[model samples]
Target chain A: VVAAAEKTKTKEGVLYVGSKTKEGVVHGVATVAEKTKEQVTNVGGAVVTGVTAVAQKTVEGAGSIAAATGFVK
Target chain B: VVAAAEKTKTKEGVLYVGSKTKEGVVHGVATVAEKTKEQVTNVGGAVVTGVTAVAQKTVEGAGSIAAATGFVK
Candidate 1:
């Protein structure tokens, strides 16, 4: 029941160099992360709901972040 | 210029769980990696030739690997 990811967390509480939306903050380890629009979300910069290719103009973090489903795009 | 990303590197040698092609193999740190198709490539297990979205049915690795250019979907 999660959303796709727009912004991707890089470090523990820091978003990637450019994986940030217009407005949003970083979440804690147990807290929920943010995305650009309505994309899948991550938790504490570890897990991404999962999405290989986003919209025409969007960003998805590519990292060790495990895909809940599987990144097959 | 370089090619689109067909596969993504994970750690330092191992490809992501699913980001692997059939004919090609893992290239060295200075060598070129393989993709499902003629997509972009990775060096070692750290770089993604860079591609937010690949073909209709291909695999891309998402991780801490810095996008050669930028990961804008």
Candidate 2:
């Protein structure tokens, strides 16, 4: 559940940026949205980065468990 | 897959606004985040609007198909 929620957070952040980019470019509202876009992208990127870090840590732990179990040479 | 991803996008946009609104109102950074909240809300609304338009179109298309197949009158 935690991983699923984190994945959703990652997707949500990226989609936020995507929607903002299209709206900002096509809606004639870029002036109002540009700074917001920058901020959102930064926030979204942070989410993705955090998720990736956690996922990497999980994978490493799993690999260590596999090594201990002799699941792989 | 496209429809599923679109649904996810719709969800993501709304959740983005939800998170931003909460962060803005509760994080003691309302000064910077208020404008961002407004912009994100607008952008998220646009995304929802776009998705709604597409879904409505799809439903209409299905209705037409049903009519042709005599599934409904």
Candidate 3:
């Protein structure tokens, strides 16, 4: 547990710095999150939610097999 | 392991619902015997003896003390 916590602290700091400097705002948010262990987990859940939401919307738009797969692809 | 099974299951469900709604528990028997993490270099006999229905009471008492110090305190 101690080692895990230490590793998380180290990784988050590096990710936060890189994200803030390189990828503009959103990616910077990702970077900041990556640097902060707790926040990173929360962000991961959010990203999963976002992807699922998009998938749901696509399924709703056209009740067609080929088009849906194409949209996903 | 997996991330959620992850941080010691988020601190043992807030210390067992704040210790069974704030300090240990009512039910659920646990022997919690001492399988000592480190070896006893100078020990001679069986650490715990299931003997004369008393079952190595002396060693058991000492082991309980050590465990209680770690957990209850």
Candidate 4:
């Protein structure tokens, strides 16, 4: 599980930079990277939002279980 | 923009594993990481989809411009 986490971390960095670079370079008057920035931002925002949602749910679930067991309030 | 891209790349990695680790450790029986995995996967999928969409658009735009300028057939 730890290894998987580490791998995911590495993959995220690689993909992020790889995509940015892939869109950055251009041969003529093309605003490829600039135009793509919004979409990338949207995607990153989605990722953060999804992660927050999951975190909230997990904490809520834990709270419920703990309450049932009289472990937390 | 390059620096911004690089910063984003770094941020992505930190966030990815940060969330994973934040959800992983727990006392008693809690499947936080496993439960959050699906949402994380969805987020990652969204990122990839967005990046691909941008790349496709850029390529299509470049092709059209080239055709109009007699750069290619």
Best-to-worst order by TM-score is: 1, 2, 3, 4
- Residue B48 of model 1, lDDT score: 22
Write the residue-wise lDDT of candidate 1 on A1-73 in tens digits.
Answer: 2222232232121211112123322221121223222223222122211123222111233323222321233
lDDT of candidate model 2 versus the reference: 0.16
What TM-score would each prediction reach against the true structure? 0.13, 0.13, 0.12, 0.11
Q: Can you write out model 3's per-residue Cα lDDT over B1-73, one digit (the tens) per residue?
A: 1111111212211111110111211211112213333211111112211110111111211110000001111
Listed in order, the DockQ scores are 0.04, 0.04, 0.01, 0.03
Root-mean-square deviation of each candidate, in angstroms?
21.1, 22.3, 29.4, 25.3
Candidate 2: residue A70 lDDT (0-100): 10
Worst 10 residues of 4 chain B by lDDT: B61-70
Chain B alone, candidate 2, TM-score of: 0.11
Rank the candidate models, highest lDDT first: 1, 2, 4, 3
Clashes of each: 15, 0, 1, 0
What candidate 3 gets wrong by more than 4 Å, as runs, is A1-29, A33-42, A46-53, A57-73, B3-73
The DockQ-based order of candidates, best leading, equals 1, 2, 4, 3
lDDT of 2 by residue, A1-73 (tens): 0111111113331222211121211121122343352322111100111100111111111110000101111
Error of 1 at B56 (Å): 12
- Per-residue error at A57 for model 1, in Å? 9.2
Weakest 10 consecutive residues, lDDT, candidate 3 chain A?
A: A64-73
Candidate 4 overall Cα lDDT vs. reference? Answer: 0.16
Instruction: Summarize candidate 1's per-residue lDDT along B1-73 as a digit string, tens digits.
Output: 1222222232221212232222222211231223322222222122222112222111223323222311234
